[PDB]
Write a protein that binds this ligand. Structure first.
Ligand SMILES: Nc1ncnc2c1ncn2[C@@H]1O[C@H](CO[P@@](=O)(S)OP(=O)(O)OP(=O)(O)O)[C@@H](O)[C@H]1O
Ligand SMILES: Nc1ncnc2c1ncn2[C@@H]1O[C@H](CO[P@@](=O)(S)OP(=O)(O)OP(=O)(O)O)[C@@H](O)[C@H]1O
Ligand SMILES: [Mg+2]
Ligand SMILES: [Mg+2]
Ligand SMILES: [Mg+2]
Ligand SMILES: [Mg+2]
Lengths: 193, 193
């Protein structure tokens, strides 16, 4: 698990307007919901051999191809499958949160950025505290894609898109992604399949 | 423990232009550096009773007042101490990275956002994968402060600032912080003491 550059697919699934919830609903609700969400999102990544890199609040950072090697295509296959499954999971999550009173508060939507690229994946931090993650623009991209894409929209990088049939690529488009000294070709892929 | 709202001080220390490194220096250098950095940053938080909530890449998210209760004042005291110590740690880190060839690549600088406020801190995620973190605008604030403040500048929220003597508050100022439906009173505090 020592940090090494690795072609991995970083999938970031951030909940759209989660702050609009961490203020709207109650703390327990925010946790219950978040945890429920992350439970299903995580489920979505793990179910897709994904690796929950970490949760950055309402954002899930899934790595594909790390720590367990995974073909770039699988990484994307999985990441996209995860992203989509997450949306499906979210479909039910909102169904339940709506029918419960946790949403209905905008029906929890999540932006998903999936990028594949060289990231230094491995354990990072002090020996006093290390977390397996991916470091590098690759990650940034995924994250920026995540935040760049519309709610319940899976925005993947050019790198990722090449694995998804054009039919599933709703719309390609370069986007000025923060931290990216170059317009990244983003392809929001079909949230379904 | 289980997620509960908690007045905690979220400290985010993100490395300024780390992507300008995850591209500049080599992977091993990026990891070696990042880990070295996070090692000292982490050190800085733990040494200040802080809690490394997680590392979000080059960003360290430290919680103060979670999971171990800590007086709001201590939280800030510690968070600020950490932020400052981090800068000091970074001072030496760059000293070494510079004298090594890892920087000199802009001398790794870090933005530090320290905010104190109600956050739902506790374990989040699925039982399949839980991470102790703080959720809620409080965190967002710290993060936005972190990214809002200039490099090697510790930007704390009004909440935090009240604990730091005005003499240490380099400059107060409200900032349109993303995700914050209200101008947050940010106070970049003296990075020294
Ligand atoms: N537990 C946590 N750990 C680390 N970073 C966190 C965090 N919680 C928040 N942040 C940081 O705070 C930032 C913004 O917080 P949101 O993303 S929770 O707010 P939003 O209403 O959901 O906004 P939208 O999803 O764009 O619609 C995150 O990107 C993190 O850097
Ligand atoms: N290991 C990781 N875990 C989670 N999120 C991560 C991540 N690495 C990156 N991100 C996400 O990618 C985003 C940007 O990546 P940078 O911060 S590494 O790039 P920069 O040049 O340092 O940017 P600047 O510090 O503003 O100058 C982060 O905010 C995370 O949401
Ligand atoms: Mg979010
Ligand atoms: Mg987020
Ligand atoms: Mg950074
Ligand atoms: Mg960061």
């Amino acid at each position: 698990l020592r940090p090494e550059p690795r072609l991995i697919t970083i999938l970031f699934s951030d909940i759209v307007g989660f702050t609009r919830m961490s203020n709207a609903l109650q703390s327990q609700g925010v946790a219950e919901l978040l945890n429920e969400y992350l439970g299903e999102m995580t489920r979505a990544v793990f179910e897709n051999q994904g690796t929950v890199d970490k949760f950055v609040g309402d954002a899930i950072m899934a790595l594909y191809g790390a720590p367990e090697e995974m073909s770039p295509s699988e990484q994307v296959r999985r990441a996209i499958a995860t992203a989509r499954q997450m949306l499906v999971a979210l479909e039910k999550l909102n169904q339940g949160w709506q029918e419960r009173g946790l949403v209905g508060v905008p029906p929890v939507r999540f932006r998903c950025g999936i990028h594949q690229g060289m990231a230094v994946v491995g354990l990072f931090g002090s020996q006093e505290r290390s977390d397996f993650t991916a470091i590098g623009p690759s990650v940034n991209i995924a994250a920026r894609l995540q935040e760049a894409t519309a709610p319940n929209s899976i925005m993947v990088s050019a790198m990722v898109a090449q694995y998804v049939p054009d039919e599933e690529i709703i719309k390609r488009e370069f986007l000025e992604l923060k931290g990216i000294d170059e317009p990244v070709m983003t392809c929001v892929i079909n949230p379904n399949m």
